[PDB]
Amino acid sequence: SGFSAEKYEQIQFGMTFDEVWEIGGGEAACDTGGVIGDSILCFTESGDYAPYGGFSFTDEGELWSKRNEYLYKAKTPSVKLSHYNRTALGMTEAQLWAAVPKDSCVSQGESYPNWPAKTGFEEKYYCAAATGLFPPSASFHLTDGVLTYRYQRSLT
């Protein structure tokens, strides 16, 4: 029926708008236009802070960007300010996951900004310190496997 993490995973870079709309669940599950513009947004539930996926397309109609919030929950929410303090812009992905426990994190997005070129591949990780709504967290973005963004809110 409706949108789901499984549908999110079935959606792949390069797919057409129509392909993504179909996989996401079409009219019943997704929307385009208004403030969404040319993009597509699909929610897995009703109400505020529902989990969702957002998909954006190049001028040729091909998927270059996937984003989501809440489609996945960390296996082991456990990130600490101590871990965060041992990250720094420019560190490699290997260094990042040696400093921070990856099981405390999930993906909130991937994109190929130069699609169909695959250079500058961006991955967005969200690491929750606890279960539940609006936990303390850190965010880490990788660009071709190097840390290009780090942020934390309320970590202990």
Task: Residue 29: give its domain's CATH number.
Answer: 3.10.450.730
Q: With CA atoms as reference, report the closest residue to 30 among 19, 16, 44, 13.
A: 44
Domain that holds residue 28: 1-156
How was this entry determined? X-ray
For residue 89, what are its two tokens? 């812009």
- What would you report as the CA-atom Rg of the chain, rounded to the nearest whole angstrom? 16
Number of domains, the chain: 1
**CA separation for the pair 69, 42 (Å, rounded):** 11
For residue 58, what are its two tokens? 């190049």
* 1-38 as b/e: b if 16+ CB within 10 A: eebbbebbeebebebebebbbebbbeeebbeeeeeeee
As a dihedral over the C-alpha atoms of residue 20, residue 25, residue 26, residue 30, rounded to 10 degrees, the angle is -90
Do residues 137 and 127 lie in contact, with contact meaning Cβ atoms separated by under 8 Å? yes
What DSSP letter does each residue of 2-65 carry, written as one string? ---HHHHHH--TT-BHHHHHHHHTHHHHEE-SGGGTTSEEEESSSSTT--EEEEEE-TTSBEEE
Give the β-pairing of 30-31 and 63-69.
Answer: unpaired
